[PDB]
Each structure stands twice: as structure tokens, then as C-alpha cells.
Design a protein around this nucleic acid. Structure first.
Ligand SMILES: [Mg+2]
Ligand SMILES: [Mg+2]
Ligand SMILES: [Mg+2]
Ligand SMILES: [Mg+2]
Ligand SMILES: [Mg+2]
Ligand SMILES: [Mg+2]
Ligand SMILES: [Mg+2]
Ligand SMILES: [Mg+2]
Lengths: 93, 225, 44
RNA sequence: GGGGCCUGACUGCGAGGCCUGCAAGCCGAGCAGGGGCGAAAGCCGGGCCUAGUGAACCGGUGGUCCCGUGUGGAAGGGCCA
RNA sequence: CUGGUGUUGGCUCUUGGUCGCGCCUGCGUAGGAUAGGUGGGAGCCUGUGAACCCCCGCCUCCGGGUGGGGGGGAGGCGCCGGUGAAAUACCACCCUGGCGCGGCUGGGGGCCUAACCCUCGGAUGGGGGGACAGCGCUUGGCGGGCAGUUUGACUGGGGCGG
RNA sequence: UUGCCCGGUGCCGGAAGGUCAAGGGGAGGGGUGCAAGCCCCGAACCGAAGCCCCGGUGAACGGCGGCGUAACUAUAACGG
RNA sequence: AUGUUC
RNA sequence: GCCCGGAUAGCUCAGGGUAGAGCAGGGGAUUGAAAAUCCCCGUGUCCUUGGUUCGAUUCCGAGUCCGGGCACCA
């Protein structure tokens, strides 16, 4: 599925199977022996984090994991409360 | 595990120090402390696959200043050659019939030469061969100019021939030459090796080279010097 | 067995063949080279 | 069938033709370059002849008057083998 | 399924593989017998303590190699000779195959808790697993479970044969 | 009651060996710069599962086809 | 340890 | 194509100077005889090619035919 910070989502990618010897080498060259739809997912991972009273957890891409911590800090200026980790979350940017 | 007499020489070499073809030539005659005129041996570990029989440093080299030795040459030849060889320098010649006198039991010669048209010598050879004395073309000892060969042999023209370990060795004089006269003989030897480098060989050719005596310790040295 | 003929030191070409067991060991042969005219030629 | 020198089992072409749906296959005098044998006339562009073969495409290697993505090179092609 | 890598962090333990480096190591038969290769070699060792008994240590083809050491108190070894394809002292250059310290590159464990995962009469917490598992990207494999397809023409029908 | 045969196939096991991917590694080589450099090629060698290999496995896939010999003949408990 | 027959 | 391995008597297989056991035939030996058992025979291009060597089936390098694994085939 989807990075809550970066918006990365799975994408369609063909997978190409080739045989043969590259022309760069001995040669004649590569022949494609099959091309198939498949998807590539992002590397989503769970990140729990303290913030205010409530805990709150993010589904986020490995690449953007720091950006979570970079949010938590920059939300020390916000006025944060209510048993609503829900709300805390939308309040993060 | 070593002579009182030998351990008194270990003091006079530095293991690590590499010497120079005259530091070593000076140094050598005062490592010849054994009760006779020691021979001065040169030893190269080579950079050949010793297995690749074609990367095989076999040759001879004529040594100026000769060997200081006294090589008793047996010849084998028919018609005319016979005497162009009886004189030329040989000590027993000829001439076909003596292979029966190689009953054997008779080995009192240090080197053997022959004229190509005896072939028939090489058969009977089994006793002459593994002792390294069997006339070859390869290194040394067969030709129709049999006197021309008997001669230079006597002016110590040495065979040399790498072994199954990639090492090679040669007598290059006596510990009683001037040092200027070894040093030169040493230089005449490497020069022969260097020009029997199998063209087709990885690594540096003369990885190591040492100088030493019968009964002495060695000197790790620098060829070219 | 098939085979080239090279003007001596360099290029050029003509190409024949020998029967390898029977008389082959290095094919030597007088032949005209297009480039700079008339020469030996070894095999390759 | 035997012997001596050789390497024309040449490069550049090729008048004219045999065969023939195409494509292919076949024979070839003669000219030039440089050569071989022969005293010379001349003969020699493989084999007495008719089977011993395989379009293109894609690649490989050796050359080389060629193109080289602003320019010089280079990559990579081309052309000849 | 499997390597690599992300999520993935903390300590160890001890393993291959390869190089310096040291120690060692070498056994067909024949033959004094344990003959690694090639030089060199006629002399080498010995009050810097031979022969010969002992005992310590590695190595062992259980024969002995090899290092030291006691005791002993003056000869031993090599050339020679037998055998053998090849000789034996002594000297040198040579991983040939181990071991031991180390570098450099892999491998497998163990312990930890804090990521992850499970769980606890709801828990900021407790317990269990634990950097494994799960999951992302990449490698190669297995893979009629599934898919798309190919499976020639001649021919007294076609097939079989040719 | 359910025999014989574990060669081949499958499954189970197996840290001798063979081969095998990304990746690591860079002996050595190249293109270009006036050069610092910037870009490539690339040899040893290290590198999983797999397959090969070794062992097992039959109520796993399977396989169990074929000269001599006895009171004549025939056959063949018996051998090959 | 085994080791048949007339 | 790359890396590994194999090729030795009729078959099945062992192994730098030298070619072997085994099976089957034949002599012997053992037994009072017969079996079992023991001994001795005769058998090779050591795949082919060039190298190294005084010598090669053995070591080297190539090649062919097989086997294993991996490339791939215009
Ligand atoms: Mg990142
Ligand atoms: Mg025409
Ligand atoms: Mg096409
Ligand atoms: Mg093309
Ligand atoms: Mg340009
Ligand atoms: Mg895959
Ligand atoms: Mg189907
Ligand atoms: Mg089995």
C-alpha cells in the first residue's frame, strides 16, 4: 500500500526475461523470452513514536522513516491534546 | 644442528640485507672456510610455472675465467672426428666400441660428448641418462664440431637447468678466484638466464637469487649490480 | 582445416586451407598483396 | 607414370556467351599490376570433367580513402576481407 | 526455496578459505633404511663433549624421522662398496603437506532488548519470541499448480514405413 | 497373506568433491583532459539454494525379461 | 571360527 | 562455447622408469578319491596428437569420444 508521508504507492513494472549473450560481449545479442506485468511495492514499515501523551504509529516507506522524527520534533511548537491520536496524526503537518 | 665452524659464519651475513654482485664476490671467499677449494654456487628461484614444460630454462653458458675445474671429457665418434677430438682436448676417445666398456662399472669421466652419427649411443643411456651425462643437443654436448665443443667445455662451459621446483643452480667458480673474477662470472650467468626467459611467463623472472659455497651459508643478492 | 595468409608483419589476406595432420606446420607461400605489391605470407 | 624449379589455389577487371521463372549456377578470350616455369613458342586466375553444398538476417575477428549527434576525440556503425 | 540488501540494534564465542611469518614435513620395490627436487660436494662433525645406553618434545607409514637434553668420555659420519631409476656426510635454493601465531574474506552459534511478531481478566504497563521471523528491492533455483503455444510435407485415403 | 530388485525417477538424509547468480574483489587494460581527474573494460580469488555426487526409502514412480543339469522320454529340486 | 561327499 | 572428470587386455576394473589383479580356458599342487582351496601360463597402439625427458600410460599443452554443471546456437 501507501507511504503516509511521501505518498509512495505500488507501481506496475514489467519483468523482462532475456536469454542470449549481450552484443556488448560475444554477441548476436539478447532475446526477450517473456515480459510480464508485476508490481513493485514501496518498503512500508511501521513506526511508533511517542508525541504528546498518546503513542501514534505511521505506515511509512523506509526511505522517509526519518521524516517521521523530523515531524515529531517540529510539533513541539503545537498545542497537542485530547485522547485522539487520530487528531494528533492529521495535526502532523 | 650446525657446525661450530658454520655458526661462525652466520655472524658474517645479514639475513635481510641484500648484497651486490661484488659485495657478495668480496664476501664469498671468506665464507669458504672448509678444508678445500670450495665451489661458488649461484641459486635463482624463478618465476615460471615449473609444470609448464616449455617454460623450462635449460641452457649452457660459456664462462670467462672458466670454472677452476678439471672436467674429464669422454668422446664418441667415427671416421676423422675421432682424432679432431683426441686432440682438441679429450682424455678418452673414441669411438663406438667403449659402450661395451660401459659394461658398466666404468664411470671415471665427468662429462660426455658425441657426434650426431652416433643415435645408436642413446639406446644402450639408461645408465648414462639419469646422471645427466648423456650427450644431448638440448644443453651442450652433441655436434659435428666436437672439438669446438670439447674445447669450451674445458674452459668451463656449464649446463644449467631449472628443476621441478622452479629453482635453478650453477657452479660459477671457486672461492679462490679474485672477487673481480667471480663477480664477472656471476654476471655472465644471470645474463644467460635472463636470455633464456621463457617468453610467456608471469611474475618477475628472477624472484630470488643467492650466492653461496659448498659448505657455506648463502647471500641473498641483487642481480644487475 | 580453413585458414588465412598474411603479407609479412601485417594485414592482407587471401585464405585457403590445409589438411593439418598431413603437411601442415606454418603455411609459407609467395603471393601478391593488394596493399604494396608482392610477398611471402604466413598462415593465421 | 617419374623427375626439376615453383605457388597464377594471383590482385584489378572482364568482351562475349552457355544455362535460366527469380535468385543462383557455368565457361571465358583479352587488358593492366606484379609474378612462376620454359632457351623459346608459349603455358599458369587450382585440381580430366560433371557431387564435396546453404539466400538473407544477427553477431565475431583483421584491415580501411568512409560517418562520428554543438566542436575535438571516443563509443558505435560503414566499406574490404 | 536461496544469496545480497532495507526494515536491523547491543555484546560476545569460533570457524573455514587464503597470504606474510615461523616451526615441522617427505616411507613402492630393492637397499644399512623413512632416498621430496635440483645445485654444489671430497670432505664434514666432534672438550662449542663421538659411539653407546637413558628421558623430554613434537612428527609417525609404529619402522622409525626430527629437535633438544641426562649420564658417558673419543670416536662418528661421508667418499669406497652392495642395492637402486636415483644416494647417502655436509651446504644451498626450492609450501610438497601439515601445524602455530597473525593479517585480509567468508560461514555458523550463543547471550541481550529496544525495533519488529505473538500474548496478558484492556496495558504508559506485564509475559513469550527477537534482529531471527514477517514485509520491500534484487539474485539464482524448483515449479503442467497455471498460462500461451508448437507438434512439417510427399503419400494411388490417412497412419506405419519410406 | 502381501515375495524379489533401491540401478533410473521421486521423497528423506548427507558441511568429500564437481559446477553454478547477483554481489565482493580489483592482477592488468582503455577513452579523454596540460594535469589533479572523470568515465569505462577486466584476470586470480571469495560468493547461496540448485543439479551432479554419497546413503536410505516398496502399502514411494516403478521393474520382476530372458545356456547346461536327474532311471529313455519329458521336466528340471541344482548350477551358470 | 567355518569346511561337503564315497 | 566455459569449468570439471573419464578413456588401460575379451568384459569389469587397479595403478616418470615397471603394465597389472579379477572373471573364463589350461597345466600343476592338496585328497585314497571327488569337490572346495592354493600356484603358474598366454592377453594390451595404456583414446589420438604434438611437447618435457636419457626414458611418458604416468608430467605439459593441444584435439577427438564420453560423463557432470553452467553458458548459447546466427
Ligand atoms: Mg536510504
Ligand atoms: Mg557478362
Ligand atoms: Mg529474420
Ligand atoms: Mg553485420
Ligand atoms: Mg562530437
Ligand atoms: Mg525469479
Ligand atoms: Mg498446457
Ligand atoms: Mg540408491
Amino acid at each position: 500500500k501507501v507511504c503516509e508521508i511521501s505518498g509512495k504507492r505500488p507501481i506496475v513494472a514489467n519483468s523482462i526475461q532475456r536469454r542470449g549473450k549481450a552484443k556488448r560481449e560475444g554477441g548476436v545479442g539478447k532475446k526477450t523470452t517473456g515480459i510480464s506485468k508485476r508490481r513493485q511495492y514501496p518498503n512500508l514499515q511501521k513506526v511508533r513514536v511517542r508525541v504528546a501523551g498518546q503513542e501514534i504509529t505511521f505506515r511509512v516507506a523506509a526511505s522517509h522513516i526519518p521524516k517521521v522524527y523530523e515531524l515529531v520534533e517540529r510539533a513541539k511548537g503545537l498545542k497537542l491534546e485530547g485522547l485522539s491520536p487520530k487528531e494528533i496524526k492529521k495535526e502532523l503537518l | 644442528k650446525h657446525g661450530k665452524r658454520y655458526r661462525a659464519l652466520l655472524e658474517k651475513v645479514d639475513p635481510n640485507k641484500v648484497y651486490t654482485i661484488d659485495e657478495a664476490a668480496r664476501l664469498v671467499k671468506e665464507l669458504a672456510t672448509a678444508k678445500f677449494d670450495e665451489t661458488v654456487e649461484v641459486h635463482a628461484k624463478l618465476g615460471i610455472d615449473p609444470r609448464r614444460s616449455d617454460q623450462n630454462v635449460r641452457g649452457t653458458v660459456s664462462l670467462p675465467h672458466g670454472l677452476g675445474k678439471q672436467v674429464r671429457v669422454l668422446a664418441i665418434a667415427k671416421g676423422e672426428k675421432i682424432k679432431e677430438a683426441e686432440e682438441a682436448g679429450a682424455d678418452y676417445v673414441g669411438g663406438e666400441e667403449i659402450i661395451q666398456k660401459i659394461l658398466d662399472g666404468w664411470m671415471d669421466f665427468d662429462a660426455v660428448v658425441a657426434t650426431p652419427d652416433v643415435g645408436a649411443v642413446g639406446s644402450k643411456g639408461r645408465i648414462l641418462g639419469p646422471r645427466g651425462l648423456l650427450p644431448n643437443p638440448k644443453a651442450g654436448t652433441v655436434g659435428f664440431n666436437i672439438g669446438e665443443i670439447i674445447r669450451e667445455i674445458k674452459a668451463g662451459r656449464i649446463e644449467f637447468r631449472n628443476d621441478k621446483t622452479g629453482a635453478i643452480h650453477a657452479p660459477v667458480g671457486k672461492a679462490s678466484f679474485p672477487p673481480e673474477k667471480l663477480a664477472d662470472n656471476i654476471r655472465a650467468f644471470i645474463r644467460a638466464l635472463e636470455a633464456h626467459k621463457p617468453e610467456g611467463a608471469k611474475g618477475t623472472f628472477l624472484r630470488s637469487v643467492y650466492v653461496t659455497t659448498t659448505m657455506g651459508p648463502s647471500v641473498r643478492i641483487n642481480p644487475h649490480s | 582445416l580453413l585458414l588465412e595468409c598474411t603479407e609479412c608483419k601485417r594485414r592482407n589476406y587471401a585464405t585457403e586451407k590445409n589438411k593439418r595432420n598431413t603437411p601442415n606446420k606454418l603455411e609459407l607461400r609467395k603471393y601478391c598483396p593488394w596493399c604494396r605489391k608482392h610477398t611471402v605470407h604466413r598462415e593465421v
